[PDB]
Design a binder for this molecule. Sequence first.
Ligand code: NAG
Ligand code: NAG
Ligand code: NAG
Ligand code: CA
Lengths: 49, 481, 480
Amino acid sequence: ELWPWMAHVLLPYVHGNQSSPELGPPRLRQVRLQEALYPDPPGPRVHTC
Amino acid sequence: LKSVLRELVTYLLFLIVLCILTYGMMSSNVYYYTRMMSQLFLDTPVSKTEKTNFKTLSSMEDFWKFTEGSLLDGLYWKMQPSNQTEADNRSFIFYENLLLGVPRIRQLRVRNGSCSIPQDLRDEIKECYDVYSVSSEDRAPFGPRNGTAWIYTSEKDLNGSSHWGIIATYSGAGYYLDLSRTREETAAQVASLKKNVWLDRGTRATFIDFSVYNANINLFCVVRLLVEFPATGGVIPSWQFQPLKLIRYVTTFDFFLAACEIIFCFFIFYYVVEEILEIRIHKLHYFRSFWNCLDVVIVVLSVVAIGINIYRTSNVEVLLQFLEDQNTFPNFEHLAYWQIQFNNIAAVTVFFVWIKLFKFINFNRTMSQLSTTMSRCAKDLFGFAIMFFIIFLAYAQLAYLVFGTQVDDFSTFQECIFTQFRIILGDINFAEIEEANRVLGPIYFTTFVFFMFFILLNMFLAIINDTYSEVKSDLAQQKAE
Amino acid sequence: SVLRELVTYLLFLIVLCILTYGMMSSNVYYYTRMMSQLFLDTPVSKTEKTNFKTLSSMEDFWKFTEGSLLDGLYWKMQPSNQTEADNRSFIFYENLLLGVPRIRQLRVRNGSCSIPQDLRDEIKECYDVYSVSSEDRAPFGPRNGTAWIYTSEKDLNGSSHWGIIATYSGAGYYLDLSRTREETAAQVASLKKNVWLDRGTRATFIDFSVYNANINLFCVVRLLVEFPATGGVIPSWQFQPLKLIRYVTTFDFFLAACEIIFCFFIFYYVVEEILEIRIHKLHYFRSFWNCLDVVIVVLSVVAIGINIYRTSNVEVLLQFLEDQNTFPNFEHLAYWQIQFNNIAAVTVFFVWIKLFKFINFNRTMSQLSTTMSRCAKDLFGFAIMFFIIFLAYAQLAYLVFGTQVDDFSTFQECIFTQFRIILGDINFAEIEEANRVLGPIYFTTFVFFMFFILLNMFLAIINDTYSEVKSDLAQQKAEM
Ligand SMILES: *[C@@H]1O[C@H](CO)[C@@H](O)[C@H](O)[C@H]1NC(C)=O
Ligand SMILES: *[C@@H]1O[C@H](CO)[C@@H](O)[C@H](O)[C@H]1NC(C)=O
Ligand SMILES: *[C@@H]1O[C@H](CO)[C@@H](O)[C@H](O)[C@H]1NC(C)=O
Ligand SMILES: [Ca+2]
C-alpha cells in the first residue's frame, strides 16, 4: 500500500506546480537485514517484534 | 531493652534466612526448560507443508491428522548421530525425549440425544451430539470391541483429581490406549485404524499427557492437556506447564541447598518455646485479637512450606524409579497437583514474609506512627462503612425503581450499583438520565453528588485525621518525664 | 422497651420490600427497548438513513408516516429471517393492536403576531409561537370531516402534555385511523395530498396501544413532533408498559395480602401518631425522626389512594378487548402509573433512611451519630453561602453561553453542567470557542475558587466538629 500512497500524494507534493519549496530531492534509504522474515503464526495477535 | 533488641535482631536474621531459602527454591536452569516444553514440546508443526499451530484445529479430519502427526513426531527424539541409533536416541535435555514409555491418551465421547427435537422438525434434527457433560455421561466406545483402546469404562485408569473449571470436573469415561515402541506401532500405525473415525460426531474431548524424561534429577516431570472437540470440528486446547525434577543434591555445589532450612525450622521451634508460655502464664486470652494480627499466624506461616517439602521430597522419591519397560506407565494425578499446591504455598508464604518484613522495616518513627494510626481507628472506620453502604443502597434502590425501565445503565440492581460507583469516579452520563424523568431525575443526581461526595468523603478524612493527630500527640507527650 | 418497635419496623420494612420486588416484575425493560428499536431506529426508507430520532424536516416526518411507522405497526413479527424453529429473542412482538391509532395536530392562526409596518410591504404572514390565546379554531382546506374542523378539549377528552418547548392543550384537528394497513396508508396519503401540515402547525401527536398477547402487559405509545416558530422539527416519544391484569396465578394473590398488611400498618402508624401528638408534647416537631414519620405516613397514604384510583379505573380497560372500532384512551392510566412509581420509590427511600434511628446502640455508632448531628447547623449555614456563589456563577454562565453551547441553554441546565464540572465532565472545546474572552476566565476562576476554598472549608467544618465531639465524649467519661 506504500506505492499507491507515494504515487498519489507524495510525488505530486514534492514536484507540484509552483508550490512546495523543497530544498533537496527526497531519498528512500532502506535497511535489508538479509534474512527472510517468518510470517506471524496465528494466535492471540502478540504485540511483540 | 537489650534482650528485646537481641530477639528482634535474631528474628530479622531468621526471616532473612527464610527469604534466602525461598529464593533459592526458585533457582535457575528451569526457565529455559519450561520455555522449551511450552514452545516446542506439544507445540510444533506436523510437517513443513503446513502453517497451522498446535491448537489451531478447525476441521475434524484435519485435526485428527494433525494430532496423529504430532503424536508420531513427538514420541521419538531427533536424529542426534552420537550413538548406535537403537530406538529414538536422545542427546538433549530440551523437551526431546518427552515420551517416557507407553503413552496413555483418552477420548471422552459426547452423548447424543440430550433432548427431543421439535415435533414439526421432522428428518432435520435426529442425531445431535450434546456438549461435554458429566451428568449425562454415556459409555460410547468403538463398535469393534478389542483391546484396551476399544472400551468405555469409569476413571479407574484416568487418574484425575478435579477440574472445577468452565463446565464441570473432568470425566474419565473414555478409551485409554497404550503406545508400543517408537518403531513398532508409534511411527507408521497411528492412522492404520482409520475405519473408526476418532473425529466423528461421537466425541467430546481428547485428554493427552507428555512427560519429560530429560532431567538429571530422576527426570520427574509430566504435564497434561485437554482439547475439547467442537460441534463443528477442530479442537480447542487447554493445558499448563509442569517442568520439574527430583530433590537430589551434590555436596560439591549444592551442599547447603536445603540444609539450613531445617535449622530455619528450628527457629520455629524457638517460637514454640514461647508459644506455650506467652498464653498460659501471662496475658491469658488477651493478646489474641487486638495485638496478635500477625503473631498468631507467624508460627504456622512456614509450616505449610515445610510440610509440602517433606511430603514431596521424602515421600515421593521412593516410587521415582520410573521403570516403564514398555509395560508400566504411571500417571501424574498427584504430581501436578502437588507441584501446583507447593508453588502456591511458597508464593503465599513469600508474600506474607515480605509484608512482615515491611512491618519490621517500620523501626523508624514515621512508619510506626502510620501503622499505629490505622490500627487505633479500625472499629470506627468499619462502623462508618455501614452508614455509607446503607445510604448507597438507598440511592441504588431509588434509582432502580425510577430509571430501571427506560435506561440501560439502571436495568438491574447490580447495574445500578456499578453505575453509581462509576458516577463517583467522574463517569456521569446525564444524557438519558435527565430525559428519562425531567423532574426527580436531576434531583437524584444533584442530591447524590452533594451528600455522598461532601459529607461522606469528609467523614472519612475527619476520622483519619483525628486518629492520626491523636497518635502524634500521644507519642509527643511521652518525652521529658 | 424499644425491641417491640424495632420488630414492628422490621416487619414493615420486609412487607414494603417484598411488595416493591413483586411489583417491579421483570423483562419490562426489554419490552420497552424492543419497542424503541422497532419504532425509532429503523430508517424511514431503504434509500435514506434518517430515523425518527433524527427528524429534521416536514417531508421527513411525512416519509416516516408511510415508512417506519406502518412498517413496524402492522404485524412486523415476520419470521422471514433465520429463525431457529421458533421466534427468536428479537422477534417476540406480534403485538395485536387495540383498535385504531389516533393522529392529532395543533396549529395557530395567521395574524397571531403583528409584523412591523416597515417590512409590511415585504412580509404578509405572521404565525406566533404556540399559545392558548393564539390557537386557530377555524376550518381549512377541504372542510368535510373531523380532520379539518376544530374540536374542543371536552369533546376529545384530552389533557395537557408539557412538551419540550411549550405545554400543548388537548384540543386540535384529529383523525382516527383504520385497522388495516392498506386503508390507513390510503388515508394518510389523502391527508398528504390536500396539504395538512401548513406553516401554522405547531404540534403533532400520534397515539396507540398494544398487548403483545404472550407476556400479559399492555403498552401505550405516544409520539410527538413539534415544529418551532423558527423552522425545524423536534421529536419526542413516550412508551409506557402497564400490567393491570393482576389475577392469573397464586403468586399475585399474595400481593393482595401484602397490600392489606400495608394498610393495617399504615393505620397503626396513623393512630399512634395522632395519639402521641396530642397528649405527649403537643407540637413535638423539634426532633428529626418526629418530622420523618409524618412524611412516610403522608406518602404512603397518597400511594394507596393512587393505587385505589388505578384499581377503580381498571374496569374501564377490559370491557373492549374484542372491539377494535374506537380509540382506547389510556393516557391517564400511564400518567398515574408513573406517579405511583415515583411515590413508591420516594417512600422506599425514606423508609430505608429511617433505619438510622435504631443503629445507635454501641459507642462507635452513637459517637458517629452525635458528630453527624452536631455539624448540621454549620453545614446548612455554609451551604447557603456555597449555593449563593453557585447561583451567581450559574447566572453568569447562562448569560454568556446561553445561545450557542446547549449545556447552558437553560438555568437548570447551567446548574447541572456546573455540578458535572465539579466531577470533571466538562468539554471545554465549545466553551472556549463560544467566547474566547470571559469564557476561559469563567472556567479557571470557577475551578480554582470552588475546589480549593469551598471543598477545604466543607472538610474543615466536619473535621473540627468531629474533633470537638470526640474530645467532649472522652472528657465526660472517666471524670464522674
Ligand atoms: C394573513 O393575514 C394577512 C392580514 O391581512 C393577509 O394580508 C394575508 O393575505 C394572510 N395570509 C394568508 C396565507 O392567509
Ligand atoms: C370530504 O368528504 C368526505 C368526508 O366526510 C370524503 O369521503 C370526501 O372524499 C372528501 N372530499 C374531498 C374532495 O376530499
Ligand atoms: C370522549 O368521551 C366520551 C364519553 O362518552 C365519548 O363518547 C367520546 O367518543 C370520547 N371522544 C372521542 C374522540 O372518542
Ligand atoms: Ca414517632
